[model samples]
Target chain A: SLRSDLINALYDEDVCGIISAEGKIYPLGSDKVLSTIFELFSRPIINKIAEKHGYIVEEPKQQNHYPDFTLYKPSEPNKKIAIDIKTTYTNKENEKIKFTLGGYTSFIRNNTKNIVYPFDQYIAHWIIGYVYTRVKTYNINELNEIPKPYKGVKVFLQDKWVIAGDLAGNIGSIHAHYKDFVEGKGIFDSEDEFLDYWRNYEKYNNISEYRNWIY
Target chain B: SLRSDLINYDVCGIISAEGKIYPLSTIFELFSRPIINKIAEKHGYIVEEPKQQNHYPDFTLYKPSEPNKKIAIDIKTTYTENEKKFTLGGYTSFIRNNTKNIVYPFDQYIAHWIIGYVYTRVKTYNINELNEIPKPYKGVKVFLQDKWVIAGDLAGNIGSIHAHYKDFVEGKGIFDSEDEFLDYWR
Candidate 1:
């Protein structure tokens, strides 16, 4: 937090520049390098925080892995969150978002780390951030335009995570909001460090019980 | 309309689709007749609006008439180092003799036309107008990203640059911005 104020002062512009000027450093089609930078910086912090809160947070440790971020909360924790982080930049003048979060899906799927996170108990989350001369709140789009086998892997556009729909399968309120980007206070003790504690302190649960929870 | 927004004009337009971007043509070359034909066959591109297709048999035997009315020409190239770049001399004498409004609609064409033209145009950096174009730069690729002026092709986008060179000159379009040239290719 020592550099918090300094980073805050110019962080928006600096981060946006890096996101915008990525073409100079990497090929236009390839986005792995930039994805790595984002996951390296923020996902771990989420995981560490989740561990501190007794929630099991999953992350990709190796280079060239799939899905950049993931979290699994144990049933006993009773409280939980799961999520992925996507980063992008935009020119505020034009209101155009110039980054893709599709890579995070890959990093999540291909990497198999045996951390103690339970998919059943943890709530899915997404932390999507965009940098510019100023930090602009994001406008999100859901990714269910295409459906795959695992209900979890469906991510679309630049900002997406989790399906906050009614699992009762009524289709009345299908499609969940991204779970990784929680701020303020919620059902959990502390939102900031809860993801880290969830991964470290809880055990995996079954589909039935995992299907239900609130407090 | 008094313009042309066809593929033969040696320049490309930028379009944005979804959140990504694409170009209507390549950087240096315009669409050949075959390319235009293919596009016509495809529904991906069609005359967004209607235009009267002209019809007339060419008059037999005629002298090679140069472009008159000073159709403002903006070259798409520039001289590096110290070559004598295109000055009003190239078009100056031509214009003086012809005496008409030299309108360079597309920025790319106006870009390589004159050094001062480009410099002054770049300073303004306000090419958001439908008939207007961003000023030219020494390097096309550099300019594409330098201003972040929507440089994608039809592959990723459908607007802001998918234009007809000839039609744009005349003035016909169904554009989110303006139709600089929309029916030339269609």
Candidate 2:
């Protein structure tokens, strides 16, 4: 339901390029740039979708917090859906892309912090992921004439566990490969398996070690 | 030479051809890369970027002959209104503890520099009017100086360095020396 609604909304709103004050069109470049713009662009669309479903959207108050949007009905406060926005670009060869799916050490281990709502309170954790191919080269001086930086935009929605990988990403985050979302191929069979794998990954090494380590 | 080269570098404008202004961070990255490359090439330094997105030092520079001599250059941007106070890097991380999320070891860097931008956003614009070109930023001032030269006391929230942009541009800082700045933060 959320997947189709988001995909349809994105299709309806065709964001070609970023426009500057000088009326120059610049191609979206870099994951940081794309992620920020994509989140801002999709906020209202997500809010509309949430409102239509008789749910209100809550944004994270602090920076670098998890779950870009939290949707919950006022009456059923405990039933919450966590939606995080992730963006990545495909290389020239169009190989599989990788993503650092938030921090494993933060909210997962200690649910009281770095997240808008408690980890267990969220009934479902979803990812609104975007993939695009970046233009190899662009002239900085001739930005006005250069074509948009990104093309072949692909968007998908799925449960976080359904798309997660066993490998670690960045420092303390889990990895998600491209095939996980595109082909519906993931390492874990279920959410419990995904959680168990990550919860015991690296430093923890054992679930029993981190069992009583909760803050 | 670095300051002059950077100051003369053209950022063009923040607006897109479609008339909407690009986001602040996007503008910074797009504008900073060209100048950084130019200066690095001219100065005979090899540039290195961080492996992770959130890592410290936007760019690291060193000569092949002097590989151990690393220079950290971080590009920071803020509005004119907030020029009086701004956040530099986190103090609790590399500075306090030698090795962490930074590209190179903290003590290995011979110098830390900040290429800061202060600009004024376009006052008014109609979001619905796609036909009208909306100017995003104006009067963009660029400054290149040592981080200790501009850094002030602690940033209110996180363990970040509170900096004075106006003082940085004027080449005047609160701390008398790098030691003082480090001592204050430590």
Candidate 3:
């Protein structure tokens, strides 16, 4: 519910933050501005939505392993949701977007080797992806004549399991290919499928021993 | 019937007859074109290069009596260094622009043929030694197929205005119909 609402709000605005043009900075296409404003605007609202729906929202503790937000029912605290904001820009050459997932190390590691970040709380990995083709130029707003090109971000909340795909890579460093993700060619059927691939494809990297937390 | 006649014919003799007195260096296509033309003429088919530069399926081949009267054939040259595998060039533009059916009336044709050439050290050798090559004048391989597959190059989209065929040994690219290719890029 929050993902859909945030995605809708993002689409309603553009000109996220500011950037330097000729040694002077102005609100342009900053992901920081987009995400920061998005989180700030969404935090209280989503917490309110969670309270309405009987879920407790826990702000992420670790900076690395997990998704961005962790929401669980207070009655069933351990049962949770994993959500992160992902962005993709269309290529001017091919007109296709290369959607980047989190790194290979973060996806596979859910142990004591690293603090459980937003991605590792392996209930399900939900990504709020903003795929955009271009930035609108400065346009006037009807409300106050604000020249902010706000209201352009678009989203499709994606399950990482559905979007995950294999790239052509060497062992121990096999990364996800964005094109493969778009084609739905190499998606893992289940968490066990991901583990099977990691074990079979990886040579030097071992699966995290601390994953008894999966149960 | 036409393919066998063309393949089995004396290509070296045809070249010699066209004034290539000896095995010249690498740049020896003055005779090969006429040689193909001479053979095609014998087979009662008109052979001509497409006027459009960078046209897909380099040559247009047709005979009045043939059932599917007009079709295409592309000439490919590969060296012994990478003899067996030849890259089908002009891929990216074809897929990105939808050129296979656009360039030619794909529905009007029967099949597309690739005349493949595998050559040895022609630059170093003289005319008399040309016979040393097992199939000196004619191509070592010929691929005839009705369709092609489209895949991004191993280098991906960071390259040039070219489409490539990965398997020169057996099959070609794969687009069963014009829409199949156009849909992928869309």
Q: Global lDDT of each model?
A: 0.26, 0.67, 0.46
Best by TM-score: 2
Error of 3 at A76 (Å): 1.1
Would you give me the overall lDDT of model 1? 0.26
Candidates sorted by TM-score, best first:
2, 3, 1
Highest DockQ: give the candidate number: 2
Instruction: Work out how many backbone clashes candidate 3 has.
Output: 28
Q: Rank by DockQ, descending?
A: 2, 1, 3
For candidate 2, give the docking quality class from DockQ: acceptable
After superposing candidate 2, which stretches have Cα over 4 Å from the reference? A11-17, A26-28, A92-94, A136-145, A170-183, A202-215, B9-26, B39-46, B52-56, B62-71, B78-110, B118-142, B153-164, B179-186
TM-scores, each model vs. reference:
0.24, 0.73, 0.37
What ranges in model 1 sit over 4 Å off?
A1-31, A61-67, A72-80, A92-94, A98-122, A132-215, B1-186
Give lDDT: candidate 3, residue A141: 23
Q: What value does the lDDT take at residue A142 in candidate 1?
A: 18
lDDT of 2 by residue, B84-134 (tens): 445678777788888878898987788888887777765112334434543
List each model's interface RMSD. Answer: 13.9, 7.1, 34.2
lDDT per residue for candidate 3 within B58-160, as digits (tens), equals 6667787663566666665554423323445444564455455335555445656556545553322223444552334332333333333322223332221
DockQ of each: 0.02, 0.27, 0.01
